[PDB]
Paper text:
Members of the melanocortin receptor (MCR) family that recognize different melanocortin peptides mediate a broad spectrum of cellular processes including energy homeostasis, inflammation and skin pigmentation through five MCR subtypes (MC1R–MC5R). In this study, we determined three single-particle cryo-EM structures of γ-MSH-bound MC3R–Gs, α-MSH-bound MC5R–Gs and PG-901-bound MC5R–Gs complexes at global resolutions of 2.86 Å, 2.73 Å and 2.59 Å, respectively. All the three bound peptides in this study adopt a “U-shape” conformation with the middle region (X–X–R–W motif) being the deepest segment within the receptor core. Here, Ca2+ and its coordinating residues were clear enough in the cryo-EM maps for structural modeling, thereby demonstrating that Ca2+ resides centrally in a pocket formed by TM2, TM3 and the peptidic agonists in the three structures.
Unlike γ-MSH, α-MSH is a non-selective full agonist of MC1R, MC3R, MC4R and MC5R but not MC2R. Superimposition of the TMDs of α-MSH-bound MC5R, MC1R27 and MC4R26 showed that the α-MSH molecules were well-overlapped especially the middle region (H6‒F7‒R8‒W9) and recognized by MCR-conserved residues in the lower half of the TMD pocket. Relative to MC1R, the inward movement of the extracellular tip of MC5R TM2 (by 2.8 Å as measured by Cα atoms of L992.67 (MC5R) and L1012.67 (MC1R)) shifted the N-terminus of α-MSH inward by 1.3 Å (measured by Cα of Y2). The α-MSH binding was stabilized by a series of polar and nonpolar interactions involving all TMs and ECLs of MC5R. The N-terminus of α-MSH adopted a vertical conformation along with TM2 and TM3, forming two hydrogen bonds (S1‒D1083.18 and S3‒N100ECL1). For the middle region, H6 packed with F431.39; F7 was surrounded by hydrophobic residues; R8 formed polar contacts with D1153.25, N1163.26 and D1193.29; and W9 was fully buried by the TM5/TM6 residues. For single-point mutation, E922.60A and D1193.29A in MC5R completely abolished or greatly reduced (by 447-fold) α-MSH-induced cAMP accumulation, whereas D1153.25A increased the basal activity but decreased the α-MSH potency by 269-fold.
Author numbering:
A (entry chain G): 10 to 62
B (entry chain L): 1 to 13
C (entry chain B): 4 to 343
D (entry chain A): 12 to 65, 204 to 253, 264 to 394
E (entry chain R): 38 to 226, 231 to 312
Write the structure that this text describes.
Amino acid sequence: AQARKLVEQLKMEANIDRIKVSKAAADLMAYCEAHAKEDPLLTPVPASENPFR
Amino acid sequence: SYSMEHFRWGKPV
Amino acid sequence: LDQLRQEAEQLKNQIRDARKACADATLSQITNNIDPVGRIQMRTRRTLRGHLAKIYAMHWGTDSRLLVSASQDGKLIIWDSYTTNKVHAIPLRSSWVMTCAYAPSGNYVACGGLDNICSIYNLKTREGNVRVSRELAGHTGYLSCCRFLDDNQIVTSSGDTTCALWDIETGQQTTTFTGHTGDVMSLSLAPDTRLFVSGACDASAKLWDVREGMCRQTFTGHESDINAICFFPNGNAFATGSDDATCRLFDLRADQELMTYSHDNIICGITSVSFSKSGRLLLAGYDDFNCNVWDALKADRAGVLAGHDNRVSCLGVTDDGMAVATGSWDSFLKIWNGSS
Amino acid sequence: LSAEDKAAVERSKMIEKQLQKDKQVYRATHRLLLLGADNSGKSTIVKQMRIYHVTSGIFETKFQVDKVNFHMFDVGAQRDERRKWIQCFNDVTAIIFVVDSSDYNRLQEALNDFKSIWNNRWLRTISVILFLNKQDLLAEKVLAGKSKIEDYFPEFARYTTPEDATPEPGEDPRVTRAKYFIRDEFLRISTASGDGRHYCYPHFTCSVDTENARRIFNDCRDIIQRMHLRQYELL
Amino acid sequence: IAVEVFLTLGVISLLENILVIGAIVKNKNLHSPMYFFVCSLAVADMLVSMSSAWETITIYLLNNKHLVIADAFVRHIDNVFDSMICISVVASMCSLLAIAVDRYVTIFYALRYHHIMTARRSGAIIAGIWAFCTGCGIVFILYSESTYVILCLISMFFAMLFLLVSLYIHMFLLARTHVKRIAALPGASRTSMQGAVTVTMLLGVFTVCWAPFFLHLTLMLSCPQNLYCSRFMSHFNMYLILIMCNSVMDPLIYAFRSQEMRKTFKEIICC
Ligand SMILES: [Ca+2]
């Protein structure tokens, strides 16, 4: 029964429609550029506007 | 005078 | 018996070939123009002390200011990272707590562990203390991680190879997410809150449509237990960190590993992961007594955070991006913010 | 400052007072992890040790001996794999490993489990109190004359009672030889690898025996004494 | 003895003991009661070293013709000095027996220890030690010309050596039972030599560095004008040098033997 369960849960994996990593890596590396200036750790903030002094 | 010397309890009293 | 294994292998070959087909450009080479972050040095602004023993979980608040911390002594402390104060200190029933969560509305916190029970505590009551609003039973293994969707639904991962979606007022598992062979170690909910990923001790990670109760993808590539998992600031990727001393970054439509955060000197395993706000800073706790700061797009080290006398078991980044808290087995939390 | 921040500090100071109260109770109680298998009598050990009193996944039993308080954590209603939740016990005083010493089939499995516990990190400091439980079944088995131990272990034909043997009165040489053979098979793994940081303490127990709390108490005194001496560069 | 030999040890002890105080203040695995007494010892040793160094400088000047104040102020400076030296000597001895008593309780009262000693009781005992030592020092230096003060100092040294020897031989004799029990273990693939070395490197350092000065005192009282005793007393400087060698060598035998403190040492030196 468990083997049939694995077989069916893996055949439901087959029908999934992938997308090439050329634009499946547009989610990364094109998300940061939209949030590059609002991330305090990546780009440090002046100490006045920082509740952690 | 009073010669000073290392710490205390040195020369016989 | 032979036919079942043959069919499983036949599906596996096709799905592996399909995964290999859609790999036209590697993520590593499409980032050559990407400027390396350089070196990130972050100092301990606040050090929250007061815990007796190892800190096994922390979770921030939706306000990026309050935070809950779960320790092995049986304490669940709500701090105020600004003023180093304490706001509540819940004494737990079972001292072997392995997870904590902080409800988005602020009215609840949740904790669970080897008692196999997700306990939900009502904070915004203030009658003198905090009372157990409701316990949620039904799991067979130990309780690795629980995350709220709203105030009346919570998703829970257990060591019985399952995850489950609950309904707090009723107290019954609305749906049960089965399909794991090993036990599940970490789950991360999504920014759209429609799905979530769960990673287990068999080297596997999976998505789950919480409204349908059926797995949608299953990813491989690790060689041992998977320890931590988290969504990238969007629900289109998740970083999975495992016990073979390596990290990986599984995208969802690609259904395939992209980056492998490994280093030859690194032999110690991984315990927690936590992205930054920008999806540009991947923070990972390691067993070698210090945390590390990777670049998601570069797979090259970018920072270290030593400062802990023992294993870094906890990690969480604010919803604002201001601060990063690390808990560890030496009973201290550290709030790290970068220097101007 | 303000009025709200002053009240915040009042709340913080009150909580810190409670935490200071809890610190002494936490550091003055000793935590023990009862590991074992299904055939071993753990539940009987726990039940018979609920005399020294002051789908759930863990049972906490409190008991004090000589004004020293002990937690004991019996992990139940959990799955087979124990490679992940045992890391939570890196700061206990001791791990009570119970072995059924009369099965002769799964004694090899018991040895493998003990070896994995002994060799695992996060447990390189934790000492093991080893309870070779159900000795009277073992005695009734070797003396009666069926399923001889040497059919499962071929090293028994070349083994003799060690000099440090302290037999119980009225005990056959065969049963004492086999009993100390099993003890030796565990102590071999104990001494083979680990440094002077954790030791195994074998006790030939039984399911109904009453002196178990004392044994845990004494060996915990030994564990603490040896730890401190080893960090004083004595011992 | 040359002033150089006596200032060098002062600077070396200042450095070592400041380092130890930092390593305890700047680490939290080392906030047990024992390391509070190690820090008390470090402070007391620091004061012995610096107070004796500055006396030596001022004596080097007054007896020479570089800096001369009248009789009353020479006496008044001298006193203050000896005073500080005496307080810090008594504090150093009391902070050695504090570590010994703490170790003894951790071993022989192993299962009840945190019902006996907490971090706050450590501070209480330290403050009591230092108030009592300040009182003893001032009384001892203002009343030095009597036999009564010197007998008090002598009695304190012998009382506090007997107790240290007794507190450590017991520990070693127990460690031998444990080493014998480990030896009997089968397949023993365990050294009383380690215990012997530590017992010696504690008691012998204490005795060699503290006993000559108190023998000087107990012969100043007993036999002041006999050739053997006079030849002994005439080495007061060679006995003060040993007192400061104790300050130099206590951090080696207490702080430097902890693995956690040796890790904090690397962390501090890399800053
Ligand atoms: Ca003087």
